[PDB]
Amino acid sequence: VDIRVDLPASSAKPQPRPEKPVFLSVKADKQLYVGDQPVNADQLTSVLDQRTQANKETTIFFQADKSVDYETLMSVMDTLRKAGYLKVGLVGMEGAAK
């Protein structure tokens, strides 16, 4: 799949803090965390739906740890995509935690 990422230049945000902002995180132990909720990919879409109130065009800014692997991380976001989440969010260098 060819995914388009819209990067904002000079410290900005294409999403001006959406109405229902959900913070997803992948920690060093490759563990998915939705705020204060530890989840697996299969349960990710479930808790996510409870977060965005089923809004699938909500940009889920994921805070991944510097030591998470790309297959784990992509497996997570691949899961959001199939849930209908057409918008995920890259936290540059994990420089924006919850």
Next chain:
Amino acid sequence: VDIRVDLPASSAKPQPRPEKPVFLSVKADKQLYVGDQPVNADQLTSVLDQRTQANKETTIFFQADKSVDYETLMSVMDTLRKAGYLKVGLVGMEGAAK
């Protein structure tokens, strides 16, 4: 920085194969590769400009290896962003190589 990623549902592409598609890659050794050109982040934007012909709204689909770390990968894309590359591309599970 809050970056918006537009994921296509049911195997699609928001970018219908742009005029000048550039394929960036981060290999398991955390080495940046632009097609057949091994580069560092500082030289990435240089070769990229030669690829997209200075077009900074070109979606650079990066093929990262499953074992690349998120800080390496983001350091790469962070570098594209400052170059003016407002569009990078997530290759889902590295399932689309050059």
